[PDB]
């Protein structure tokens, strides 16, 4: 085909211009907004970023001051913990196009998956020099007793570009009538404290004293990382054109209808090129470490499976990617070496065959993918 | 010995998509191409028979 | 040539340059148009008091990259008052040997389970399939227990082991050297697996805990119950058939990526004990275990370790702490007590005479039955791989 | 053509292309050799400053310095404890000099350790704690020090230092050519003695190793050091002689440190990047009068440009969040790292760059200890058109 | 071929011009006194002058015995264990000699024909003899006494004073030659009762309190300045200078009684001599633990299969005395052992009694050619 030579010559001119921008421009990170509020009044806020350069991500710092007003009982931290401080993040392009519409716990897990380690954590070493947990970048107390007050902090990286060396998905925000936007929803007093026997999925603390837990404050700070001082030529800006035409998105969903020993297939959308998959088997307010799933797979259109593995062998594949295990009930599927395009090789789906299904059991599906108009 | 329609051994290459091939077209599409449809069938059968 | 015997420009002149340009062109065609598949091929639960050696037949599909072997074991103690404790190699001694024969009946990898575990550690950059401890309040860590074993089996208690082995055929996911083509109607291809008995997996107090799993006073009564295992084949599907059959990297599928191991003896204190690297291999890593007569020490019985060459005598010659400091850069920890690792991946040893490059241990106290347990990892090539034949049914 | 500004830009583009070509010929054809150059055991009560002569062989890439020590607490009842810098204060100063009297590194002990950490992505030569039942972990004690030396006890210390000449194992920038006949190279090493390594309760534990109520009776017993030289041999030879990267060997990869004083609460305190270097990293240590705090005495750390514009201006907890993205842990209490390796700070591109700290609390005798890491080359400075 | 007889005839003509026109210089390189409880290894960097022929290393020591009552006595290797290990490096960083100290001393004895730098006892009434104490050590050191040791080493580069094969041309634009020297220390030079006296100097019941007070060394450099210049440059022997004369030591173990233990000559060199030291578990015996020694070719033909008293009879023909207990010399200077595929000639020792940790310490000298065969382009 003669049309596969121009679309490879357009990639060669694009990659020539990507290494001009990354080598001859300035990486800036500056604070765009900060605000402290009470979540009883409002918890959904909109952040107007700066319209300059090539934006390649946002760093969101969220703090909290949870107080337990119970008489005698305490609460304990959930498994997702301080990652449920932001309930949702939505990003809008300067042309008002939605890029990322994931939740908070899914944004933390892709931050874990893109690093190879738990995000912004300090690993325990044998060193006698006092490294380790010094500054408390991500921090939350394990229990909050009756009458106590716990201070929380949590960091989110909202990505636009794929990495620091790969400017795919980045946003050129030097446009005149820019509609660039970053929505943020936060945990109020109804979604962060679950009672015993409830679903601790979107909660932060859970225990016998959650009926009188409340926030005192939530403060947020947004920092925008971008590239300033772009190379200007005679014909104008020198830019990686089909790198800024591509989006890099993060979505989440919720599927239901699980039956014991029956395969449950979630289809991949034909227009996206999927890079990763995160499935959370929420078994009716209960989370289990693989002891309620027969297998997980990635089945193609005919019936052919590509990775049909036991839940312990599925976890063995993620341990050579992020060097630990995700929390119990969370399952990760990596496709970065070969993305699931499901337009050039059939209709691929994602299969979970459960062993035990409780009432109101659902399957939350986080996605990460590229998108263009090819 | 070269053949203008030979794509390799026909039991190994009949269901194989081509090199770039993001999405394949159909070989014909009164409503559409007609003699291009008939020559797309003669070229396929010449591949399965080797000149 | 000043340091190496063959100086990589003039050891590239010993290879066909037109055949490796065509070989790299065929590898990137294969990796572009194929798909990574991992399938379960064989599962079996057995009692090792009856049978312990198993031939596993892998599937005849695609270009095979490697095997993932999951071994699960249950161990009863059956002593009156005494307990046993886990050894240093521990659950990695669940597989005593692993042999692979290719479709051409050519032996690829023949080693023990402890040496297969350490090459799996050394190629990752971390202990194999382990979870690090962090400060994060989000509950990461040991949730699924991929590799897991109890540390102490008490008097009248049952322990459950789990261990994973990656049996490599291809070198990496990108370098397809050592991979085999198995897309054939039949092949002479098998995977031989020796497992731990009740004799070799429990050692008494005083005996050599090298191939053992648990060691203690109550080890005479320790029994296995079940050693269920599972084999997963990892291959590339939908090979790019061009003209005259499969487009194949011919030099890559004719090279073997082998993992042999050995045992050298004859050490005396305060002199050099040289282990010769063999001829016409391309060595990538060396692992030495200083079995000092059933005792394993953390460097305190070695003067120095070294890699020696015929001309240009010592290329590295370090203290046992300085040798371990070069290892802490690579795998972010150090190997168990008595294990020493040497990396040769950027400059592989390929030396065209027999004893031209050697590995040196200079010990300082040597017991009676002291030996070095070498484990190698190398490329070799004895065959050529001309193009194949098709069917053409009448 | 014909203008000396663009005539020099053309031959700098050709010299840079021939340098990157000659570099990967060297890194393909050479062989890495590491050999010992000196070992000595001494007493710090007599002498504690040593000078080491490395061998003039090949292309030298750097030095690995093992330092072992023994410390006795001769107090009757009181014990001591480690400081936050700990065994990295076994060496007080590392100075290296070229065979042409060009100073390469003048770190302290702690600053050389932190650059070794930041170039690895982990604490230098440490072992991660994992869940594996196979006995990995801390077996050999590559970097080791007891947390407490009791009254009457003895503690063995071990510490390693990579003194870098070349930048990395794939970038030969800063390496010293030594296969030509020339003067000898010089590696000076000042060690900790019985005056600088033990601090009383209340003294400034910046360059100490142990601190406690029994530090007046603590003393060294021995300090041993071993120096290993890491270099490349069997260099490739072309038709015109040796094939060498000619502007990588004539560039200096350097590791100065410094200090400044005069900090006022809630007033921006600027430390300017003075010379025409290409700065790669920056370590700020806020010695708040002997006290070291975890960001609670700093309002913000920042980096300014010529038109007073902050190119990063973060909270101390957000400054530490960018540190955890690189080395997967936090630097010790009071240490602030700034990575600039993708775009090095160069005060000829966008004007004069400074480093800003706005302190919240300031104690008496407070200072800001800096550590730089940069490139240095020879600046060509052609005239463009008019002279007047 | 005639291209190897003509090129060797131009090498021998150019060697006779160098040996007749040059002048031998011996000059001091470096002297240093040290405490072995502080430093033990020293690297000496001589200048690059002329055609280097070798190095003279004078080692002086002082051993104090701080034991209360018991004394120590000399071992059989004696003051030759002062230098433990000596390495020379080329201007081009090419190793030449990488042997130990006792092996360097015995090759100095074998090249002379007598114990090296010794004085023979004569009947003369004129007071010759041990006047200057060139190589000297006390026999015992009593409890509370101090002994002075002196020992000379010749590190060879050229083969002999009339054969320039092996010599280094240090008029090259590369770099400076190096001479690394490991000396004895307080953990090597004193062996207890029943320990291995192989690399010790003194041995006895008071060795736990024997300490070095000082070791001093001096390095001299023998070279040929005043080199002749022809119509095209330096007249040089191109084969003699592009040839290494090396000294190397090894160690083999794994012996069992009445079985031929074979040490194969690896390493396609031209072996000139062999020294085998039978360390039978810390015990050195005068031939009473060996059945025979031989040099068989390919498990095929013994060429000098002799019992240990006839083997020593061929040594007394050569060095006019015997090497110490356990030391066995094999001379091949007239017809050098030149294996040509790997595994062609071996060295055999058939033991009679083998103790624990019994080993066989080999020491070779040989000629070899190097790489970068350009011959002064």
Q: How many angstroms separate the first and last alpha carbons of chain A?
A: 16
Interchain CB distance below 8 Å, B20 and A4: yes
Nearest to D324 among A26, A124, A137 (CB): A137
**Is the separation of the CB atoms in A63 and A151 below 8 Å?**
yes
Least Cα distance to C16 among C332, C280, C291, C250 occurs for C250
Q: Count contacts between B and C (CB, < 8 Å).
A: 22
With tokens 């029943």, the residue in question is E194
**C140 CB within 8 Å of a chain E CB:** no
Are C271 and E251 an interchain contact pair (Cβ–Cβ within 8 Å)? Answer: yes
Method used to obtain the model = cryo-EM
- In terms of Cβ atoms closer than 10 Å to its own Cβ (0-12, 13-18, 19+), residue A233 is exposed
Tell me the pairing of strands D198-199 and D210-212.
Answer: parallel
> CA torsion D1→D6→D7→D10, rounded to 10°?
-110
CA atoms within 13 A on the CB side of D370: 21
Of A232, A244, A355, the C-alpha closest to A292 is A355
Which 3 state secondary structure label does DSSP give A42?
coil
Rg (CA), chain A: 22
Given a contact cutoff of 8 angstroms between Cβ atoms, the answer to whether D156 and D143 are in contact is no
Residue D292 burial (10 A CB sphere; 0-12, 13-18, 19+): buried
CA gap D225, D217 in Å, rounded? 24
- Is there a contact between E253 and C269 if contact means CB atoms under 8 Å apart? no
The helix (run of H) or strand (run of E) holding residue C283 is strand C282-292
* Selection from D264, D226, D232 nearest residue D248 by Cα: D232
d(Cα A288, Cα A305) in Å, to the nearest integer? 24
Report the interhelical angle of D109-118 vs D316-327 (nearest 10°): 70
Quick one: how far is CA C224 from the chain centroid? 25
Q: Are C370 and C267 in contact (CB under 8 A)?
A: yes
Distance CA C328, CA D125 (A): 6
Residue entry with tokens 């194992």: D169
CA distances from A120 to B28, C136, D114, D318 (A): 56, 8, 19, 11
Chain B positions touching C391 (Cβ under 8 A) are 9, 11
**Dist CA A283 CA A331 (whole Å):** 14
Read off the tokens for D175: 């390496």
Q: Which two tokens stand for residue C113?
A: 């389970």
Say yes or no for a CB contact (<8 Å) between C117 and D128.
no
Residue A339 Cα distances to A293, A336, D11, D53, angstroms: 25, 6, 44, 55
| Local structure of A329: helix, strand or coil | coil
| Helices (H), ranges, chain A | 3-21, 104-115, 241-244, 311-318
Q: CB within 8 A of B26, min separation 6: which ones?
A: none
Instruction: Give B1's contacts in chain C (Cβ within 8 Å).
Output: none
**Element housing A278 (H / E):** strand A273-282
Give dist(CA D108, CA D111) in Å, integer.
5
Q: CA D117 → CA C44, D160, D279, D335, distances in Å?
A: 47, 12, 18, 13
Environment class of D245 (CB within 10 Å of its CB; exposed 0-12, middle 13-18, buried 19+): buried
Q: Which residues contact C344 (CB under 8 A, 6 or more apart)?
A: C283, C284, C285, C286
Break chain A into its structural domains and give their ranges.
Answer: 1-233, 234-374
Spell out the residues 6+ positions from residue D388 whose beta carbon is closer than 8 angstroms to its own.
Answer: none
Is A2 touching B (CB cutoff 8 A)? Answer: no
Rounded to whole angstroms, what are the CA distances from A164 to A64, A161, A344, C39, E69? 30, 7, 29, 35, 75
Q: Which residues pair with A254 in a beta bridge?
A: A364
- Put simply, the answer to whether D38 touches E37 (Cβ < 8 Å) is no
Find out whether D189 and D40 touch, Cβ atoms under 8 Å.
no
Q: Which of E179, E187, E344, E208 is nearest to E265 (CA)?
A: E344
What CA dihedral angle connects A68, A69, A72 and A74, to 10 degrees?
A: -10
Please tell me the distance from the alpha carbon of residue D200 to that of residue D214, in angstroms, as a whole number: 8
Q: How far is C139 from chain D (nearest CA, A)?
A: 14
- C255 Cβ contact partners less than 8 Å away, ≥ 6 residues apart: C177, C178, C379, C380, C381
Nearest to D91 by CA among D206, D189, D198: D189
Give yes or no for a contact between C273 and C192, defined as CB atoms under 8 angstroms apart: no
DSSP string, D70-138: EEEE--SS--EEE-SSGGGGGEEEEEEE-TTS-EEEEEEHHHHHHHHHHTTTSSTT--B-B--SS--BS
Q: Which two tokens stand for residue D25?
A: 């010929």
Distance between CA C58 and CA C190 in Å, rounded? 7
CB distance from D28 to chain C under 8 Å? Answer: yes
A1/B23 CB distance under 8 A = no
Q: Contact C312/E251, CB-based, under 8 Å? A: no
Q: Which of B4, B9, B17, B19 to mutate to test the interface with C (most CBs of C within 10 A)?
A: B9
CA–CA dist C195, C198 (Å, integer): 10
Cross-chain Cβ contact E370/C310 below 8 Å: no
**Token duo for residue D172:** 């030969």
Q: What resolution in angstrom units was achieved for this structure?
A: 2.8
3-state helix, strand, coil in chain A (%, to 5): 15, 40, 50
Give me the DSSP letters along C164-219. EEEEESSSSSS--TT-EE--SS----EEEEEE--TTTSEE-TTS--SS-SEEETT-
Query: Which one is the CATH code of E1-230: 2.40.50.140, 2.70.9.30, 2.40.110.10, 3.40.470.10?
Result: 2.70.9.30
Contact list, C312 vs chain E (CB under 8 Å): 93-95
Q: Which residues pair with C66 in a beta bridge?
A: C168, C234
Of the candidates D110, D310, D93, D121, the residue with the CA atom closest to the CA atom of residue D209: D110
For chain B, what is the radius of gyration of the CA atoms?
A: 12
Angstrom distance (rounded) from CA D143 to CA D87: 8
Q: Please provide the size of chain D in residues.
A: 388
Which residue, among A300, A284, A90, has the nearest Cα to A182 in the 3D structure?
A90
- Contact E37/D at CB under 8 A: yes
Quote the DSSP letter at residue E331. Answer: E
Architecture per CATH, E231-377:
Sandwich (2.60)
- The strands making up E346-351's β-sheet, listed across from edge to edge, are E261-264, E346-351, E290-294
Q: Distance from B30 to chain A by nearest Cα, in Å?
A: 27
CB hemisphere CA count around D162 (13 angstroms): 23
* Helices E308-319/E101-112 angle, 10° precision: 70
Residue C175 sits at φ, ψ, to 5 deg, of -85, 110
- The string of DSSP codes covering A171-228 is EE---TT---EEEEEE--TTTSEEPTTS--SS-SEEETTGGGEE-S-EEEEEEEEEEE
Given a contact as 3+ CB pairs under 8 Å, which chains touch B? A, C
Which of C68, C135, C325 to mutate to probe the A interface, most A CBs <10 Å?
C135
Neighbours of chain D (3+ CB pairs under 8 A): A, C, E
E87 neighbors E100 (Cβ within 8 angstroms): no
The CATH code of domain C243-394 reads 2.60.120.20
CB B21 to CB A344 under 8 A? yes
Identify any residues that bridge with C378 across adjacent strands, giving them in sequence order: C258, C283
Residues 6+ apart with CB under 8 A from D100: D182, D183
Contacts of E43 (CB under 8 A, 6+ apart): D37, D38, D53, D55, E178, E179, E180, E181
- Angstrom distance (rounded) from CA D229 to CA C315: 12
Owner of token pair 């600046």? D379
Backbone dihedral angles phi then psi of residue E301, each to the nearest 5 degrees: -160, 115
* Residue range D1-238, CATH number: 2.70.9.30
User: What region does C266 belong to: left with phi over 0, alpha with psi -120 to 50, or beta?
Assistant: left
Closest to C168 (Cα-Cα) out of C40, C288, C64, C56: C64
- C156 with C78: CB under 8 angstroms? yes
Q: Which positions ≥6 away from B44 have C-beta within 8 Å? A: B27
Q: Does C228 touch chain A (CB under 8 A)?
A: no
3-class SS at C114? helix
Q: C1-242 has which fold? A: Adenovirus Type 2 Hexon; domain 4 (2.70.9)
Residues from chain E that touch D39, judged by Cβ atoms under 8 A, are: 39-41
What are phi and psi for residue D232, nearest 5 degrees?
-105, 135
Q: What are phi and psi of D259, to 5 degrees?
A: -160, 160
User: What's the DSSP call for residue D183?
Assistant: P
Quick count: other Cβ atoms within 10 Å of Cβ E42? 17
For residues C384 and C19, give the distance between their C-alpha atoms in angstroms, rounded to a whole number: 11
Measured distance CA(E155)–CA(E221) in Å, rounded? 10
Q: What single-letter DSSP state applies at residue D331?
A: P
Task: Classify residue E369 as left (phi > 0), alpha (psi -120 to 50) or beta.
Answer: beta
Q: Do C134 and A142 touch (CB under 8 A)?
A: no
Q: Label residue E316 left, alpha or beta by phi (over 0 means left) and psi (-120 to 50 means alpha).
A: alpha
Which residue among D120, D134, D137 places its CB closest to the CB of C117? D134
- Say if residues D299 and D359 touch (Cβ distance below 8 Å): yes
Token duo for residue A72: 């005698």
- Of the candidates D359, D55, D92, D80, which has an alpha carbon nearest to the alpha carbon of residue D179? D55
Distance of CA B28 to the CA centre of its chain: 11
Buried b / exposed e along D120-130 (16+ C-beta atoms within 10 A): bebbbbbbbbb
Q: Do D86 and A136 touch (CB under 8 A)?
A: no
List the beta bridge partners of residue A145: none
Residue C347 near residue D32 (C-beta atoms within 8 A): yes
Burial per residue of A199-215, b for 16 or more beta-carbon CB atoms within 10 angstroms, e otherwise = bbbbbbbbbebbeebbb
| CA-based nearest distance A324→chain D, Å | 9
| Contact yes or no for C241/B12 (Cβ under 8 A) | yes
What b/e string do you get for D175-185 counting C-beta neighbours within 10 Å, with b at 16 or more? bbbbbeeeeeb
D367, containing H or E segment: strand D367-376
Q: Assign a CATH topology to domain D239-388.
A: Jelly Rolls (2.60.120)
* Level-2 CATH architecture, domain A234-374: Sandwich (2.60)
Cβ of residue C186 closer than 8 Å to a chain E Cβ: no
Question: What is the edge-to-edge ordering of all strands in the sheet holding A44-47?
Answer: A44-47, A181-186, A86-92
- Measure the CA–CA gap between E361 and C273, rounded to whole angstroms: 12
The three-state secondary structure class of D222 is: strand
At E134, list the tokens.
């060139």
- Cβ atoms within 10 Å of C150's Cβ, excluding its own: 18
| Residue to test with chain E: of D34, D41, D59, most E Cβ within 10 A | D41
User: What is E16-38 written as a DSSP string?
Assistant: HHHHHH-EEEEEEEEEEEE-TTT
**Inter-chain touch D42–E38, beta carbons under 8 Å:** yes
8 Å CB contact between A284 and A359:
yes
Q: Which two tokens stand for residue A59?
A: 């760093």
User: Contact C139/A319, CB-based, under 8 Å?
Assistant: no
Whether B12 and C241 lie within 8 Å, measured CB to CB: yes
CA distance C66 to C78: 38
C-alpha pair distances (Å), B17 with each of C33, C243, D160: 10, 14, 58
- For E46, the token pair is 């001589």
CA torsion sign for D112, D114, D118, D124 is: positive
Beta-carbon contacts of residue D98 (< 8 Å; ≥ 6 apart): D104, D176, D185
Q: Work out the minimum CA distance from C114 to partner chain E, whole angstroms.
A: 27
Closest by CA position to E151, among listed E82, E100, E225, E253 = E82
Q: Enumerate the residues of chain C whose CB falls inside 8 A of the CB of residue D228.
A: 318, 322
Angle made by CA atoms A361, A366, A372, in degrees to the nearest 5:
145
Give yes or no for a contact between A74 and A209, defined as CB atoms under 8 angstroms apart: yes
- Angle A203-A209-A210 (CA atoms, 0-180°, nearest 5)? 25
* Contacts B18 to A, Cβ<8 Å: 1
CA dihedral in degrees (E24, E30, E35, E40; nearest 10)?
A: -80
Question: Hunting for tokens 């002749």 — which residue is that?
Answer: E228
Contacts of B49 (CB under 8 A, 6+ apart): none
Half-sphere exposure of D301 (CA within 13 A, CB side): 25
What's the rounded Cα separation, in Å, for the pair D281 and D326? 12
Of D55, D58, D181, the CB nearest to E178: D55
- Under 8 Å between Cβ of A49 and A278: no
Nearest residue to E337 via CA among E243, E268, E250, E244: E268
CB atoms within 10 A of CB C4: 25
Chain C residues inside the 8 Å CB shell of B12: 241, 245, 390
Q: Which run of H or E residues covers position C25?
A: helix C17-33
CATH of domain A1-233: 2.70.9.30
């Amino acid at each position: 085909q003669q049309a596969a030579l121009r679309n490879q010559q357009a990639m060669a001119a694009n990659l020539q211009a990507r290494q001009i921008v990354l080598q001859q421009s300035y990486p800036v990170i500056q604070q765009v907004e900060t605000q402290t509020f009470d979540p009883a009044n409002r918890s959904v806020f909109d952040v107007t970023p700066a319209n300059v350069g090539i934006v390649k991500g946002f760093l969101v710092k969220v703090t909290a001051a949870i107080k337990n007003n119970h008489a005698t009982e305490a609460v304990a931290l959930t498994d997702f913990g301080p990652a449920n401080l932001v309930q949702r993040v939505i990003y809008y392009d300067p042309d008002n196009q939605r890029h990322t519409e994931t939740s908070g716990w899914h944004l933390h897990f892709v931050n874990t998956a893109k690093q190879g380690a738990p995000f912004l954590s300090s690993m325990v070493t044998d060193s006698p020099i006092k490294y380790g947990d010094v500054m408390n970048v991500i921090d939350a107390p394990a229990t909050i007793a009756a009458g106590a007050t716990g201070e929380l902090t949590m960091y989110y990286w909202v990505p636009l570009a794929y990495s620091e060396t790969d400017l795919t998905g980045a946003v050129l925000a030097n446009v005149p009538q820019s509609k660039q936007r970053l929505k943020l929803e936060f945990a109020n007093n109804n979604t962060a404290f679950a009672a015993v026997g409830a679903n601790p999925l979107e909660a932060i603390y859970q225990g016998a004293g959650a009926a009188d837990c409340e926030f005192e404050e939530i403060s947020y700070t947004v920092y925008q990382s971008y590239l300033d001082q772009l190379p200007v030529g005679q014909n104008g800006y020198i830019l990686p054109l089909i790198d800024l035409s591509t989006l890099y998105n993060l979505e989440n969903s919720a599927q239901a209808g699980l039956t014991p020993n029956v395969d449950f297939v979630v289809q991949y959308a034909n227009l996206y090129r999927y890079l990763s998959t995160i499935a959370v088997f929420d078994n009716g307010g209960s989370f289990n470490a693989g002891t309620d799933i027969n297998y997980l797979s990635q089945r193609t259109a005919n019936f052919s499976d590509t990775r049909k593995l036991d839940p312990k062998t599925w976890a063995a594949q993620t341990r050579r990617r992020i060097a630990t295990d995700f929390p119990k009930g969370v399952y990760y599927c990596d496709n970065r070496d070969k993305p699931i395009y499901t337009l050039q090789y059939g209709n691929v789906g994602f299969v979970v065959n459960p062993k035990t299904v409780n009432q109101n059991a659902r399957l939350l599906m986080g996605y990460e993918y590229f998108t263009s108009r090819t | 010995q070269v053949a203008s329609n030979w794509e390799g051994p026909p039991y190994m290459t009949y269901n194989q998509p081509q090199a770039g091939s993001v999405t394949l077209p159909v070989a014909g599409y009164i409503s559409s191409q007609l003699n291009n449809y008939a020559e797309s069938l003669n070229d396929y059968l010449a591949s399965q028979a080797g000149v």
